[model samples]
Target chain A: SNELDELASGINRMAETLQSAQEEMQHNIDQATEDVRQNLETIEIQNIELDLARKEALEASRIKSEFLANMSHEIRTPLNGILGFTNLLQKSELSPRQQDYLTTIQKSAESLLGIINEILDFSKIEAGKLVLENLPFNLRDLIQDALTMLAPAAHEKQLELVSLVYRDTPIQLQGDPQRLKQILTNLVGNAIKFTQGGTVAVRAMLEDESDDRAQLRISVQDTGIGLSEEDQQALFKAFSQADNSLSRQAGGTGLGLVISKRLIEQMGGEIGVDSTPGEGAEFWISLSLPKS
Target chain B: SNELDELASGINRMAETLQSAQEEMQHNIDQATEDVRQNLETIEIQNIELDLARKEALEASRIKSEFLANMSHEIRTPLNGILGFTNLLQKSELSPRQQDYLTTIQKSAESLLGIINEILDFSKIEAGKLVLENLPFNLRDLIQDALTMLAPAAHEKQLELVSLVYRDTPIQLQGDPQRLKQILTNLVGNAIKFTQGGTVAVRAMLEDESDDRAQLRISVQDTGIGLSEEDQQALFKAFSQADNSLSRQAGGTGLGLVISKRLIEQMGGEIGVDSTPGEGAEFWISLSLPKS
Candidate 1:
């Protein structure tokens, strides 16, 4: 009986040793497997990174193509209309009434041309083809020219357009007059477009005076088709509009506000808009210029 | 003096032994540190694997949810059409022939219900709640059923309807016959819907038959308001129709072609359209099935 007991105990000891050995073997195998897995994981992570980069590149290419297609179609459709109307206007014989119609056609064509020119100017600035020429210029004459240019459009719309410059403001300042005029033209033009028959006034004042620099605030107010608050917030985003239906009705490329904002910022100025639905809109530009 | 020298050498030997012992201990400590580092690396690998799995699962769920929402919207839009027409038919009193027109309206409603049911079935399959059932069935029988469903509309329009099965087509095939019927129903229904006073035809043929698999091509051709090449390309995109303006006039959810394409692709087949502007359109779907 003692011998049988010894044999059983011996077997139990062997079983315990086997179990311990098996556990150690499993631990080692698990470690080795993890190492291999980590190497595979590193490869997989690299693959994912490559895939995301490829997708981004593809999406960018797709957006560029869509933009080109949309622009070509939109521009061509309008150009055809303008050219067709211009041809009809150039005919030889016409009565006074027909002449009036021809004149309207010509005016419409000119407005379209003006819009195209604005787009080209903005594109030039974006492409770095335009540079600031900081030289002394008659600031008073620049403002006057802007008002004179906008006066005809305001007359046609039966809206009064006016501008005021503070008497203490410098007549000559070191800044880019042409670019600044472009900004005023856009603001004033938008005001005229949106307003049915209300006054649009531009007011300029020296907000801050210093030895080297002066902060000037130029405000343009219009009693025209107003903007929704959301539209005002998104106005400066490129190719965005107050509303898509409004773009069709107002007949602008929707790039005017974007360009104006960029130009003002480039000139070390800040621009903002405030408007309420069914009321009117106000646009303001603040610039710090070198005092003469 | 010699005794003193020997004692000094023994002391030097002991010092060298102690320095060796210190170096051995540092090496053992470095090895243990490396073991812990390997353990940490294994855990990091596991964490990355878990993250990838989690992201994939989330993406799949999101796609499933989007599909369901789109399906519900599509069904509701068409349901409005069917309900509106049914109410008009029921409320208005008319002549004996007009009673037949009411019957036609009821039939259309029933057809729309079938479409809704199909959409639900597809969603269920997509969510992995249903498995595709492969069974032996007569392909010709399913095609004939689709033709019967659309025959009434063709007759009302005074259009000739035709369905031809190839003589060599196998009598039986192992595939999901229900899905096949749904695809044909959609294609044929579209042909009848758009064809005002023209002929609509459905045809099927065995493109290739082998011991393991058989390829069958089904087509729906109509003499209707034809598609431009651009429209043909856009037709297969979900919720996209040939003409946005004409979409409501020709009642549809624009999912028929898109869903049909997906089904064929899942079955390792192809679907496409051929059309010319102001001409006509031909839609083709090919399927491969296990031959019985």
Candidate 2:
């Protein structure tokens, strides 16, 4: 009886210890669950705040872009008035000196308009509003037109402005002719602006051809003060000139190459420059266009 | 003996149940710990990514602002040449027609310069580069000058341009005259542009007076196209026009009010507009300036 009583008491003690241990384990688990729940809630709140911040940032950027676009439109309207009136005035009678002055004024006004257009283009490009038009135009005529437009500046500098289109190059092509002309104009204009008296030549060569598409390489070479290797690295960067001193003398917005590069790339093309610091520089654009 | 055997069996069963329960609890706790740890890691990674995104956004904004400043400088250099040469030509002897042409050219060039300057100012303000100069300026003369400058446009549109300074208005004040002129020019220009036959009047009155400073209210009121309540809400917003159609016809960048508001706010002032559709519009600026 005594041995049985001792054994029964020991079993009772074991049961009590097990019961308490289970209770303690349950308590600890409940506490951990509560902590985990709070942590998850904290993470959820943080995520919500972060999402709000991202949205606000995106909204701010959008507002900035829209503001710039509206401002550009507003500016261009008045500028159009100025240029239109100036053109009308030019058609009226005037002396040689006055005519010359009018021409200079017209040129200055046109240049200002060009700058405004460039700025508008840049903002549009940056905002990803790069809408392109697929129109049929004579490729040779486009290049020739650019050359003619820049001829006066080249003549003023007494520099030769020449063009060489390969015999086999396509005559009619489907592309954004206006943008192409802009790229060509910028490249050729830069060549003339930088060169003192050396020749600024534009050459287009056929690289590859298919039934529907043709790849052409166009180059603008100038025997002006060439850029150093370091300068070439940053030459295509927006708002970066080869050198401050050079920009001061050359008188350019330094956005030409950047804009040109973007325009070419948008048309499935590439641009680069080869230069020897003291000899000359050759800026080239390689593009693929649909043949008509 | 039978009861003892029964008791041992019962104890053994209890121990097995306890052991199994303990093992199961251990497994669940381990899983919960692992889940919580993963959650924490995810939150940490998310926080890091969010930080990176924020930094990238800020850096992009900075780069964009810097590019705009550089572009502004680049554009202004060529514009200076255009305007500088035009000004020199204006001084030269020429026939009446030639002189008229020169006048138009000069005016156009000057307007273009103003636009460029406005853009530059907007960029500067956006970049938090608001530098103000405190100089003694003739307050009445400044208002008269603005009226004189805008007189041609008002006359062209058959609108009366007038200004009135209260007797208590200070004759001389210490403030940034250029920015003050800019504000007045933008306001008066807008009034004239919008008004056709009715009068465009500017009135300045002393609101409060002190020993060193004076609170004054300047208003430009016009009897032309007015604004809706919604239009007034957005009138002071950057790149916002009172109405798109109005902006198209009126020919403005819609930044004038924004810049003017900022200028006034920077000078510790307030701006507001009151208008009724089809009746007219009145824009007012209230500022405190140092008395001289």
Candidate 3:
């Protein structure tokens, strides 16, 4: 009877332990399920909010770019009128002094137009609207024309402006002639502006040549106010000036270098500069383009 | 002895059940813990990526704004030189024809400068750099000055240009006079450009007044080519034109209305337009400003 009583008591204890353990396990499972549900809900909310934020940001950027484009188009219209009327007036009879005055006016207007164009181009590049053209043109003529156009400025400053094109360079190449001219103009113009009585030399050489593609390197070397390592580091950065104070005297948009660099890169090319302060600066661009 | 055997067997079955239940509970706990840990790890990684993305976006925005500012400053410097030199040359004296030429040049340069100013203002507003001035200026003179500036253009088209300032309208007000002039100029200019005959009228009236504040209403009315309802809907939208062909003929940047709207809103004002296809158009602005 004593042994049976002990066995019955042991069975009762075991049953109680089993019941409590099962209850505790059920509670744990319920808690974990609730936690997982809460975490998923929070993640879903966060993702929705992030998507909304991203959309808003994109919309704002689009609006900004759109406004710039509209302004560019609007301003250019009246400008055309001004330029057109001035040209007409120029065609009319006038005295020698009048002709001189008209010339000055025309030049000033052209300069204004150029500045406006630079701003527009910078904005277009920023908005990624600048598309390069692939066409055939004489690379030698392009360089010569740019130098000729800038010759007067160099002459006025008494700076020697020279160019050398290697015979191996392809006579005709496939690329954007206008943009290439602009880049060359910017680099050469910058060289002239910074040089007072020194030389500004432009050189072109064949870096490499293949049956379909050729690598040509063009360089602008100026013996004027060179730049320090720090200044060189920021040379191709937009709106960066070698010397902000001298920028006024030098006279440029400071965007010239940046625009040139981008143009070269867009043409599947690389651009770089080497300079030592008080010595001289040399800017070089290597472009890979299809041979004509 | 039979009862003892039964009791012991019952205890043994209870113990087995408890042991199996505990092992199953342990397995469930381990699985739940692993799931929770994985969820926590994924959340952590997502948070890190989001933070990195946000930082990159902010940096890009900062760089863009900085580039704009630098370009603005750089371009303006050269532009000032061009205008300054032209003005100086104009003062040097010559024939009447030369004088006329100089006058045209000066006016054209001034116009270019105004366009540049508008672009800069637009950029500033977009970048949240524009701040309204609360200085006192003669409101009547401001309007008159704007009308006078547009008189030549209106006369060129044989259109009547006039203005009316009611007696109740304050003589002076605390606001940004330059921005006000710009807004008026844009409106009046638009009105004259769109109007080929009849008249372009500007009117100002005191809408309401309190001890220190006043609501003033100004409207520009034109009689020429009006707009359709569809055109009117999109008139104030950036880069929108009533008709693409008409806009091309009329000559405008299509930014004037949009800019005017933004400027008016910035000045705590409302702007709207009323127009009919064949009759005429009326653009109105109402402002709440401090009485000086």
Candidate 4:
């Protein structure tokens, strides 16, 4: 064969495949462009929907805030007035029967007001309206004050209410005093309420410390009708009582535990309970606070 | 130049640029593939997060349901008992003063219960626990019934309460009777509360209809202290009062309007208001239902 014939055929083949390659490349690039555009649009649409849903959720949370504010402003305000007026009326009062009547009204109103405040606290925490105050407070004093406030309830139940802060625990700290007291008081009160004749003890220990942060674990231990694993799991819910089968020896909205858990979490802390049936229960909280 | 030389030069140039074009095409194809992969990943991640956030919002809604269930079960159970016992005590009382004391206790308890029920309704609506009934009902009867229920309040204020169902309006429709009643009663009640000596009128009309579907526009128009544009916009929020000043001459949690809006929306309907200050206000709801 002639070399000219071979060369001509080779050129023809090269031209055919080159044009085909170019066409294939054009098709692939267009396909890729189409894919990317579709994916990009999907991401944009998803992002928009996420933004809208998040806004909707935030608005729902805001609803809780408004409800709480309205309730406290309207309900509590009137109830407080009633209590004050009832107290004033009692002071200026009448016969024995009238005094008894006034006392009953005063007691009922006061109890109702107390429950309302508890409900408001639960609502406030749920609404994320809880802003902790950073102020200097004594750890030992806080525990003792909590125990002291709860002593009356303890003694009434023939239980010894006690507080012990470990030697290593820091006394001076920067945190929310009112919220801490609220948590401590609530834990101790629960201890006192559950304990029929055993000791209700609050113990605080220093767990970890950095140059500016102090970690402490405070526990409220109660020797009473203890809890089962199921009970402990179910304990920290609003308006739940662990002793559901038994006639409620302890009466409460059960919001205290829920509020306590959120408080600890809001402050970047941890809370847990350890207990066995017929054995004492210990509720503990781990808190991180600024060290002074 | 020779023809063979020109052809050879053209072939050489084509070879050089063809290789160059092939390299650029390879790079572009690679880049497009990478870009599409990146975009596809973004969409998937966004989809996962969107799903997670939607679940979270749903959980938040469930939280409201739990709260309402717990509060109603716990608080109302005891309050009802108190009211019942107080009533019994009043029935078997001694002096007029004792009777008066018992009466006060009973009234306070009843009012508290009423507020609790209202709050529970708000919560139930928020939690999306409202299930509308699909039953045939008399449109005229419903409007007149709402007016009758609110007639006492209207008369107490020396105001006229009236209702009008257009001749074209269907008497029979398939929808949630109780929820419809609730919405109608609430509107009429608000009209009664807000008006001094004017008429509070509820008017229903057949806005649109198909062979098996109906569209309705029911309105409560009151000749009372009307609403401004801003007030109408703000009127649908929970716990809001149009009369924020001057001692809240009309009183309500304003959850009724919010709940009403949601209920209408849930039923594929529309709720709106039309008013001018110092003249009167017209609150309207557009509802779609099955013709029965």
Candidate closest to the true structure, highest TM-score: 4
Of the candidates shown, which would achieve the greatest lDDT relative to the real structure?
A: 2
Model 3 per-residue lDDT tens digits across residues B1-292: 8886886698799889989998997997798788888878877776776787687566545544555456456545645654665566556655577567557656765766676665566657656788888799888899999999989999997888888999888867888999989889987887776654668889999988898988999988775534455543443332134333122322233555666877888988887676664656677889988878
TM-score, model 1 to reference: 0.42
True contacts kept of each: 0.00, 0.21, 0.14, 0.18
State the lDDT of candidate 4 residue by residue for B1-292, as single tens digits.
Answer: 6887988899899789989998997897798678778877888898899889979877766765566556555556545555655555555535665565555666667666766776677677767776777789888887787788887888888878877888888878888877888888876776566545557778888888889887889888775534455544443321124323112311233556556666778898876666654556667788888877
Model 1 complex DockQ against the native: 0.03
Per-residue accuracy of model 1 over A189-288 as CA lDDT, tens digit each: 8767665655888888888888888889987876443444554443333113333313232223345555677788899888876665455567788998
Write down the C-alpha DockQ for each prediction.
0.03, 0.25, 0.22, 0.30
| lDDT per residue as tens, model 4, A1-292 | 7987987899899889989998997897798668767777888899899899888777777765566556555555545554555555555536676566556666566656666677688667767776788799988988888788877778887778878888888889998988989888877776565544567778889899888989999988775434455544443321124323112211233556567777888999887666654556677889899977
Backbone clash pairs for candidate 2 read none
Better of 1 and 3 by DockQ: 3
Q: Please provide TM-scores, in order, for all candidate models, with all chains considered together.
A: 0.42, 0.69, 0.69, 0.81
Q: Please count the clashing residue pairs in each candidate, in the order shown.
A: 2, 0, 1, 1
lDDT of 4 at B115: 65
Q: CA lDDT, every prediction?
A: 0.62, 0.73, 0.70, 0.69
- Model 3 is docked with a DockQ of 0.22
Task: Give a tens-digit lDDT track for model 2, residues B1-292.
Answer: 9886886698799889989998997998798779989989978987887788788676656555555566567656656765776676668765687567657656765766676676677767767788999899888999999889888888997778889998878767899998998889988887666544568889999988889988899988875434445543443331134434232322243667668877888999887666664556677889999977
Q: Per-residue error at B14 for model 2, in Å?
A: 3.4
Best by DockQ: 4
